[PDB]
Amino acid sequence: QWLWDIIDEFIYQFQSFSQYRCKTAKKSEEEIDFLRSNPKIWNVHSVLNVLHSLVDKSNINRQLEVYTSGGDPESVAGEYGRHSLYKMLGYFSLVGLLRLHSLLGDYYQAIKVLENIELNKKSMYSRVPECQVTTYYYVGFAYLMMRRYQDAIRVFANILLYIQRTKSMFQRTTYKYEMINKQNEQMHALLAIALTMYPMRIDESIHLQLREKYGDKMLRMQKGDPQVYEELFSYSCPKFLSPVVPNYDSVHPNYHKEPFLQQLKVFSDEVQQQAQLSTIRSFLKLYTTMPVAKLAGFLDLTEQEFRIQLLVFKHKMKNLVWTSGISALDGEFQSASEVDFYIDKDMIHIADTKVARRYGDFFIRQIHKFEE
Amino acid sequence: YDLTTRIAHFLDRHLVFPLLEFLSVKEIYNEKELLQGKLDLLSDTNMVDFAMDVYKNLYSDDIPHALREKRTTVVAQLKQLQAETEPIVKMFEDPETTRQMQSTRDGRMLFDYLADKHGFRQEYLDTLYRYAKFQYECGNYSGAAEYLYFFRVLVPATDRNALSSLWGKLASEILMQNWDAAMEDLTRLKETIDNNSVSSPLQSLQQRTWLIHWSLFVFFNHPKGRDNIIDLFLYQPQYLNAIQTMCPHILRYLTTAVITNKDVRKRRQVLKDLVKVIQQESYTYKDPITEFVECLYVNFDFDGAQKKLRECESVLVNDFFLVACLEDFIENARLFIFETFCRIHQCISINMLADKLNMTPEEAERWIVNLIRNARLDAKIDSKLGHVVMGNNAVSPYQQVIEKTKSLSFRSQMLAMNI
Amino acid sequence: YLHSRWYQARDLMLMSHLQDNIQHADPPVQILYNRTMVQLGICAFRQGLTKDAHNALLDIQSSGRAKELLGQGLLLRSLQERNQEQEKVERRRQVPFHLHINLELLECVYLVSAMLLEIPYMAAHESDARRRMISKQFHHQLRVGERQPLLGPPESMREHVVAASKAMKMGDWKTCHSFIINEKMNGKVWDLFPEADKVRTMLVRKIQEESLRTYLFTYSSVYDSISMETLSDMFELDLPTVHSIISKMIINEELMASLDQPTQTVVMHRTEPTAQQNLALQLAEKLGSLVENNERVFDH
Amino acid sequence: RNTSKQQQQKHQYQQRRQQENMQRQSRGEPPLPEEDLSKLFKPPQPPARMDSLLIAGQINTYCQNIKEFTAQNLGKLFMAQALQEYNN
């Protein structure tokens, strides 16, 4: 008690609020125009699309942790509480997008992501920065599950920067804000190590304090240490399939551990190969064109002993990150050296300091408005 | 340093039971000899480290020292007087001396297990009283100390005997060439100097030197115990301001574990304080072998430094101690003086790197292959010329001042917008 | 310091800790204490150590007391020295003339020792890069001699400093030697020590090595390749000094500079002098962020 | 900012210790004065905002931004034209 009844108090309030918005958002523009006109606060009935959905994201896997196999609540969640909110006419305000954010919130918990080609296609409503932060939050995981991290590195930098300009002012998140700050920290630290030396994209969102800490971690996982990947996985393992929070850790049920194992077994099979991928590419391409002795200078470094030195290097060439070539007549290993650029980070903040002038000009003239 | 005002009138007037001598007229390797002798003042008749003088060169003059120490390993000292075949004919004292010890040991070996099996706090201390007597009669008998000072240690003379028998047991286990029971007395010395005493410097700088002796010969992790032997007592390395700074080789085992067993960041703390100021400057005026380690490094020399290391590295290996950090300090003198060159520089000919540090060019080439892979020398390697190009020079350092005036002032003005 | 080697005198001041005993024990012994740390600075200057000539003249030359530290200050010299009867007590007490010492030497000890220090130090500051501007320094002992547009030949002890200071600012080492060595023989200040030939020769290289720095500090933007063969011949400095110069010109000053000591070549490329104004504005706007933060620090 | 620091050296940095002197004495004696309670809180020399230096300070630093906006655009219109008119 004090949890499970309040779980059911919430869910029955949630599945009722799943019904009140499933009925009155399809043919009616009548209670909607009643909701536009007589309540002047636009917040509250857009709060309920996030307040009641985030704690539904909690309470569904709260029961599903006990009801592991042969489980009720995700079918109670998605098909009846979320998909009833998903496929309708839009509440033409910040409700119709957040019903999809209610759906994609559990369509991310379910690891079944493919419909991110659909979720942004029917999202032809105005991408408000309230929803745009939650857009690049949810959508960027499918790019993180796309194994093309050179495109994923730029998406998680947006949501971690928090100069994406959100300001609401009615506890809208709700009650959980730095968890988004800490998860995108770990999702971008996931993207910091995986591609370096190419980023050089860890500078804006991740500040110089965590550039030193996770960057020294970025060295060690590439210089060989699995402790960083253990830090990179175990800090991030609930961060792929968190409800928001579990129920109560106990010894007697075998139940709670059974979806806890399901959170472990999925996302360790993916990124451990990427931990080996970070080690293969890790050496700096010091020179583009190696002779055989300096091919054997890097065949030494690729993997020696002894057997299977050329073929292991052949495996380690073919990881999308070593575009190379053997000149079999010349004995001339002809490879790449891809390098990047730094200095151009003053063109973005030149308007941000033009904002930092204007944002200082704004509220103090708003203070001057309250003392005019 | 504060206790120097006690030293300012006293000036190195230590108080030891084995007094002075070290092995008269010598031939070779003479910077070790006073170094050995000034510690042989303070280290109580070592037991091999008499013959450590003899391993470089044989002399007949190692004989007159431990002959007059018949407490320690009685019969072996009967053998040393006849090893030179000397009619010293008064060797009729150690069989007289041991006979009182046998009547005291085996007369109380009855009591020794009355001390244990009863555990009677009188009869334990009654046995411990006669073994306070006996372990200062002979602590050699260090196993008779090792049984004694494993139970309730504190004999009925907790300060004078229980130091000089446990420092005796620290001596005599090392004089029996034990180290784990000396690791018992590692702890039993390093806490007794920490209590400490009245702490006269003639006691203290001796007890500070008593710290140096066992930590000088590395058996177990003195690459951790270097921090015990630097970062104790307001961390002067020589522990004796006391112008004869003669806990002398301590920098070499200190700068061993910095470059070998640590990184060298954290060697800047070594070069500034532990090389320059007063005490190591005195030891810079004592051993030229430690001097070319530091003085051509502090000149930031690149050819004279690396070779006068290498010349002194041929004499760094002449440290004929029980040493166990010998070539560690030698090899990582080369590896750090190459880090000293390629820290700020522009290039090096691999053929010059081969010929300066006396290696071959592929050894010189593959070493920067390791130095990129270690990320100690972040550069590139020209694969075919044998000329490692290292051109680290930055342009436009502005973005960092810009980052911390708009992550603070823009975001702390956010906080003033809630009122 | 004098009758033995000054390494002992540096130690025994640190040894006996006589910062505190001097107060309770008869402050005419504080006068002897102030006689002693002067003579420490003498054997800082006899051993040629310029920092210790500044730092033994720290309890002495951070104050105008040094006149009365021989017991010879005047009553109407300031509005402080009162009165005649206490002046009678102090001057029946102190001091014999052979116990008097050359304060003009002491000022030429104090001024010149930081002159070779602070001028390459301020030449880093006056290269449109300053954060360590130390107030109340030889900089301020220069200020009393600095703003003198009428100043012709160096004749006073400060005038020999200020002339050599401008010779130090030119980067020419030779021009300082005309202003110091001859003029302290003119004023017999060089003529005071038997060690003074060494002390001069010590201060020969302190002028040569450091005006080499002001040669590099002032002509820094366009020097993008800097020799080591020329500077060994120009400033008359051998390579193990020059390697100890140029590495510490690169390491300790932290100048962006490539160096090939086998080739004996310094390659710098500072980039840029118009972006020194960007450094001059980051001198300004970084102060902008601090007191903005300090606006909230006091108020909260 | 030396104005802004010195006022905050007086607005609060005095009054952090001015009340610390005042609160320590139990804010007064019942049968008598309250002598030091009248003595404590002597007002500092800036008590409030220093808004005579600060207004023309708000003017002339805004005038610096005009010179900036002069120096910004005059930079651009040549950095246009040089990149423009060289490029043929």
Side-chain angles (χ1 to χ4, degrees), chain B residues 303-322:
Chain B
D303 197 1
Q306 303 188 358
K307 291 183 180 180
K308 292 300 293 181
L309 277 170
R310 181 60 186 167
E311 178 176 358
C312 292
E313 285 173 356
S314 297
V315 193
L316 286 170
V317 74
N318 285 320
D319 186 74
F320 287 162
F321 294 163
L322 304 167

Side-chain angles (χ1 to χ4, degrees), chain B residues 181-296:
Chain B
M183 280 189 69
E184 182 182 1
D185 302 323
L186 183 151
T187 307
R188 293 187 190 281
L189 188 67
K190 72 100 174 179
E191 297 297 325
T192 312
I193 56 93
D194 194 75
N195 298 122
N196 184 358
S197 62
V198 180
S199 179
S200 296
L202 310 181
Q203 295 177 356
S204 296
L205 310 176
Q206 178 184 5
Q207 286 164 351
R208 286 166 182 266
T209 311
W210 286 3
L211 291 169
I212 305 294
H213 300 298
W214 57 268
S215 67
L216 186 64
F217 42 90
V218 182
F219 286 99
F220 286 152
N221 210 167
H222 292 167
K224 290 182 181 293
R226 46 93 61 218
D227 287 326
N228 291 318
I229 210 63
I230 182 60
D231 294 331
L232 188 62
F233 289 120
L234 293 174
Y235 63 109
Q236 53 180 359
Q238 296 287 318
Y239 294 104
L240 278 76
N241 293 109
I243 54 172
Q244 290 295 321
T245 72
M246 201 66 76
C247 297
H249 283 299
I250 193 165
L251 181 68
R252 300 185 183 183
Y253 298 149
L254 193 156
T255 318
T256 302
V258 167
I259 311 168
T260 65
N261 298 307
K262 294 171 186 293
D263 47 352
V264 292
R265 293 176 293 175
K266 204 168 87 281
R267 197 260 178 274
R268 188 175 180 178
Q269 66 180 1
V270 177
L271 176 64
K272 286 171 87 289
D273 293 331
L274 304 179
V275 172
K276 181 64 180 66
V277 284
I278 45 171
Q279 286 180 354
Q280 179 58 38
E281 185 185 0
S282 178
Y283 177 59
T284 310
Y285 301 154
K286 285 176 185 178
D287 197 359
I289 306 306
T290 314
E291 178 177 0
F292 289 104
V293 175
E294 303 298 326
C295 288
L296 290 176

Side-chain angles (χ1 to χ4, degrees), chain B residues 5-59:
Chain B
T5 186
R6 303 174 66 87
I7 304 169
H9 296 87
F10 288 166
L11 295 173
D12 195 79
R13 287 186 174 96
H14 292 92
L15 301 172
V16 290
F17 176 75
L19 299 173
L20 179 62
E21 289 293 326
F22 61 107
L23 216 149
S24 72
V25 178
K26 298 288 288 294
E27 298 173 353
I28 62 168
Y29 192 63
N30 295 318
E31 72 270 16
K32 186 69 70 68
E33 297 179 354
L34 182 62
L35 142 49
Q36 182 173 358
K38 294 294 289 181
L39 297 176
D40 192 74
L41 308 177
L42 296 156
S43 182
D44 301 341
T45 66
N46 287 319
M47 287 291 183
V48 189
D49 287 331
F50 287 126
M52 176 265 292
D53 189 80
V54 184
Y55 291 124
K56 61 185 181 296
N57 191 0
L58 178 60
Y59 301 97

